[PDB]
Structures are given as structure tokens and as C-alpha cells.
């Protein structure tokens, strides 16, 4: 668990000329319909840790 | 046949523009330069950086 102690500088990835007024955001998570590993038998959605 | 081109100068970034000029790149002589909007005057030389 937790963030590691240490210094790290993030590099530029991309810059988009999109002009929209953002005030809110949300994360997108994967939900697996089935098992995390082939050959389980439990029903419905799961997520990996 | 008719086409009407029309242009918006609106508040989001300027985003469509006409094709920018370019020239040969001379070295070891005093010149004026523009590099991607960076203007100046100088002797241009192959860097060790």
C-alpha cells in the first residue's frame, strides 16, 4: 500500500487545444464480467486490486 | 456548385491556420532565424547538447 518515498519529475505527455470549461472529473475502472483467473465459478462483476 | 468557406475567431485556441514558411538551414554564419516562433539573430552551430 501507499505512495513510495522519493522524488520523481513527470514528463509532458500531450497538450490539447480543446477550449472546454472543466470543473469536475471522474475515474474509469475496469469491471470484469467473470473471473480474475480462468477456471473460477462465482457470478457477476469483479475488479482486480 | 457553390462552397461558402466561413471562419470563427472564437475564444477557444486558434486551431486551423495556413501553411507556415520554411527555408534551408545554414550553419557557421551570422543569420536571423525563426524556429517554430522562436525569433533571434546569431551564428548557428551543431550542438554538443
From Swiss-Prot, chain B:
Residues 11-33 are annotated as: Disordered. It comes from the Viruses. Binds to host ACE2. RBD also interacts with the N-linked glycan on 'Asn-90' of ACE2. Cleavage of S generates a polybasic C-terminal sequence on S1 that binds to host Neuropilin-1 (NRP1) and Neuropilin-2 (NRP2) receptors. Interacts with host integrin alpha-5/beta-1 (ITGA5:ITGB1) and with ACE2 in complex with integrin alpha-5/beta-1 (ITGA5:ITGB1). May interact via cytoplasmic c-terminus with M protein. May interact (via N-terminus) with host bilirubin and biliverdin, thereby preventing antibody binding to the SARS-CoV-2 spike NTD via an allosteric mechanism. Attaches the virion to the cell membrane by interacting with host receptor, initiating the infection. The major receptor is host ACE2. When S2/S2' has been cleaved, binding to the receptor triggers direct fusion at the cell membrane. When S2/S2' has not been cleaved, binding to the receptor results in internalization of the virus by endocytosis using host TFRC and GRM2 and leading to fusion of the virion membrane with the host endosomal membrane. Alternatively, may use NRP1/NRP2 and integrin as entry receptors. This is Spike protein S1. It comes from Severe acute respiratory syndrome coronavirus 2 (2019-nCoV).
Amino acid at each position: 500500500r501507499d505512495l513510495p518515498q522519493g522524488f520523481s519529475a513527470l514528463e509532458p505527455l500531450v497538450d490539447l487545444p480543446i477550449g472546454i470549461n472543466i470543473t469536475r472529473f471522474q475515474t474509469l475502472l475496469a469491471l470484469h464480467r467473470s473471473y480474475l483467473t480462468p477456471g473460477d465459478s462465482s457470478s457477476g462483476w469483479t475488479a482486480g486490486a | 456548385r457553390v462552397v461558402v468557406l466561413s471562419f470563427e475567431l472564437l475564444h477557444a485556441p486558434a486551431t486551423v491556420c495556413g501553411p507556415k514558411k520554411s527555408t534551408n538551414l545554414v550553419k557557421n554564419k551570422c543569420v536571423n532565424f525563426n524556429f517554430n516562433g522562436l525569433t533571434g539573430t546569431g551564428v548557428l552551430t551543431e550542438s554538443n547538447k
